[PDB]
Amino acid sequence: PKSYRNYSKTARNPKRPFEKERLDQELKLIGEYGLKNKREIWRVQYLLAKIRSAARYLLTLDEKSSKRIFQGEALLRRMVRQGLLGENEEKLDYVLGLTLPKLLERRLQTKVFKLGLAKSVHHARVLIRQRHIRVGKQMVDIPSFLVRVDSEKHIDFATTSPFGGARPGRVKRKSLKKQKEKTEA
Amino acid sequence: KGIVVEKVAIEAKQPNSAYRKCVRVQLIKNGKKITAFVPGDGCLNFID
Amino acid sequence: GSLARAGKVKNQTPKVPKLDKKKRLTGRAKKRQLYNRRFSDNG
Amino acid sequence: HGASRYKKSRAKMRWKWKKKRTRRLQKKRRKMRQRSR
RNA sequence: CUUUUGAUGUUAGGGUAUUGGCCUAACAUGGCUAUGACGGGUAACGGGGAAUUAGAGUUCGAUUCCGGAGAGGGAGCCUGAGAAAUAGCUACCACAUCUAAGGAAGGCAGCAGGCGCGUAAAUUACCCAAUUCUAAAGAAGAGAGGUAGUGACAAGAAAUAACAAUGCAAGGUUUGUAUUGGAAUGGUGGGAAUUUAAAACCUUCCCAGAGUAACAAUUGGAGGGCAAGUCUGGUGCCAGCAGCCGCGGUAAUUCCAGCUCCAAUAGCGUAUAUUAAAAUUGUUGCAGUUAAAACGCUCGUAGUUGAAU
RNA sequence: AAAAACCGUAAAUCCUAUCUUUUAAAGGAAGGAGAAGUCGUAACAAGGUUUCCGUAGGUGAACCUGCGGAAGGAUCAU
């Protein structure tokens, strides 16, 4: 009868809907990462709360306990692959301390803006939606794509992009100008 | 859902002074008489 | 017994149109301008 | 209502007389019930 | 409370597939109960689970799976390894179909669909291709099941632009900002590859195909709680708004409108119910002189708690 | 094979009784809300008789009075 595949929410409403400083901080983050909605930042901090809860539960467990010495490096290696923690990091206190902008730095639009390609973060957003960039052998049109610690070396333009060597420019303009040229000649 | 019986103006409380336009409704589910307020400026005219 | 004046102010309020204005810009662009309008000009 | 009857802080009818009037009404009601049944 | 009408037990038997007061005969007077029997209510099928959770908790669970029960309500029965079977039979009750009036025939709480009831819920579609079942077992069937249709129940991703030059503002020739003006790309239409039982969808490719990108985002607010107006007209304790406090009697920051602003955003209000908030049900963790609340007082059984070694 | 009888299973109908739920009703008697209504002045000051409790009787109403209490009293006091 009912389908057997699950589904879950990815965002949580903030409650206390009209905190002035919370609204200001949200607007700052929205503007300086160029993302369309505060639902997106709600998703990011929902994920952040998930990781943080796992980390603090692990910290409650005593050292060299089996659950900790399995899940702790599981989570730590996941964070390292995501690029959320550096090499100088080795413990769980740092994954407790990682923050919202540090999470937001890994979005596709922020990474492509940082690498160049697009001159504004909103330009990067629209370009990703315009499907002109490639994470390597695979094109992505999802701005919320989280780049891992190896793919940033090979984010670049998609091979089908006009900026990637495809169809040069406006075919309408080119055809019109060539018709004018052939008529004049 | 119910059937409109008639329309009535009800006094507001003492500190205020207004004639709230309500309607008397005969509920089709049971047959009970209830009083329902009609929101809006001229919405009483919108109901027969 | 004084239901005859229901909606008098609504009925007798003078009617004015919505004029023409400009299409309001929405989406990520809408957040763009209300983000960038609070630091540059002010000081 | 309970042990905090009287307590005239609000200028109400004296609780003793309210109780007496209620008892008179109850006597009348009991007499009517006995007459009916 | 149960106990003539089996209630509790013994003995013997009957019956059952088997044990058994399951039933029968005799006998005995037992069995349960304030640790709540026996009753009543449940808008009660139970569980796996769900919502909300700091931790405790509170509420929900008709509904994917498991178990139970039922096929309008009862009862009875045949076949069969297996049924007290219901798209099997028999009868009664209530409905209800055909009839030439003599008689026949029925059970959608299966899939669609209709009426009714309602605040409240989809197509009288396609197919056995997948899953699996039945058979005389490849080859046939299967409203099981799958596929599509309706579908803002929920859930996820995600458009409504981005960019270059002057004019203007701010700053020592840096940011924002009306003009131009070229790129980019979906939405859309058509063909195709593909997908598919067939078809559709997705994906991919090829043609056209955005300047007011008219390919035009809404919902609800702007006194406080609570983000955003002592802006402009109308009304004038009327109309109305307002969850609460309150606003409205000529200057209405609250009504009716326009402009602007705020909030969330393809979503946003409303109603009811529920959780947190609620340490306002308190085991964690409440309060009892005066806010509600120490029995008038003592004895006392059950209960709860009990010196050291 | 029809058919009949007897234990049993036992639908269904009717009578009676009880219980549950809903509901009509002359009359009676409350509560709440409303309006500038009528009569008085009960309480808050020693509220003009200190207030209040239990009980009993009486009165148009608030209320009054007797008995025994309390201070939440108007006295922490020769």
From TrEMBL, chain A:
Per the record, its GO cellular-component terms are:
cytosolic small ribosomal subunit
Gene Ontology MF terms:
rRNA binding; structural constituent of ribosome
Tell me its family.
Belongs to the universal ribosomal protein uS4 family.
Q: Where is this region: Disordered?
A: 160-185
Write down the Pfam families for this protein, in alphabetical order. Ribosomal_S4, S4
The biological processes this protein is annotated with in GO are: ribosomal small subunit biogenesis; translation
- Output compositional bias ranges, type Basic residues: 169-180
Q: What superkingdom does the record give? A: Eukaryota
Keywords annotated in UniProt = Ribonucleoprotein, Ribosomal protein, RNA-binding, rRNA-binding
Alphabetized PANTHER family for the sequence: 30S 40S RIBOSOMAL PROTEIN, 40S RIBOSOMAL PROTEIN S9
- Please tell me whether the keyword rRNA-binding is annotated for this protein: yes
Protein name as annotated? 40S ribosomal protein S9, putative
Span of domain RNA-binding S4? 106-170
- Every copy of the Small ribosomal subunit protein uS4 N-terminal domain together lies at 5-105
Which InterPro entries does this one have? Ribosomal_uS4 (IPR022801), Ribosomal_uS4_CS (IPR018079), Ribosomal_uS4_euk/arc (IPR005710), Ribosomal_uS4_N (IPR001912), S4_RNA-bd (IPR002942), S4_RNA-bd_sf (IPR036986)
Automatic annotation (TrEMBL), chain B:
MF terms (GO), sorted A to Z:
structural constituent of ribosome
Decide whether keyword Zinc is in the record: no
Biological process according to GO: translation
Q: Please state which protein family the record places this protein in.
A: Belongs to the universal ribosomal protein uS12 family.
Provide one Gene Ontology cellular component: ribosome
Q: Which residues form a coiled coil?
A: none
Q: What is this protein called?
A: 40S ribosomal protein S23, putative
Q: Does the keyword Phosphoprotein apply?
A: no
Alphabetical UniProt keywords: Ribonucleoprotein, Ribosomal protein
From TrEMBL, chain D:
Q: Which GO terms describe its cellular component?
A: ribonucleoprotein complex; ribosome
Quick one: where's region Disordered? 1-37
Quote one Gene Ontology molecular function term.
Answer: structural constituent of ribosome
The UniProt keywords, alphabetically, are: Ribonucleoprotein, Ribosomal protein
> Which GO biological process categories is it annotated with?
translation
InterPro entries (alphabetical): Ribosomal_eS32 (IPR007836)
Its quaternary organisation is: Component of the large ribosomal subunit.
Q: Which family does it belong to?
A: Belongs to the eukaryotic ribosomal protein eS32 family.
This chain belongs to the protein called 60S ribosomal protein L41
Organism annotation: Plasmodium falciparum (isolate 3D7)
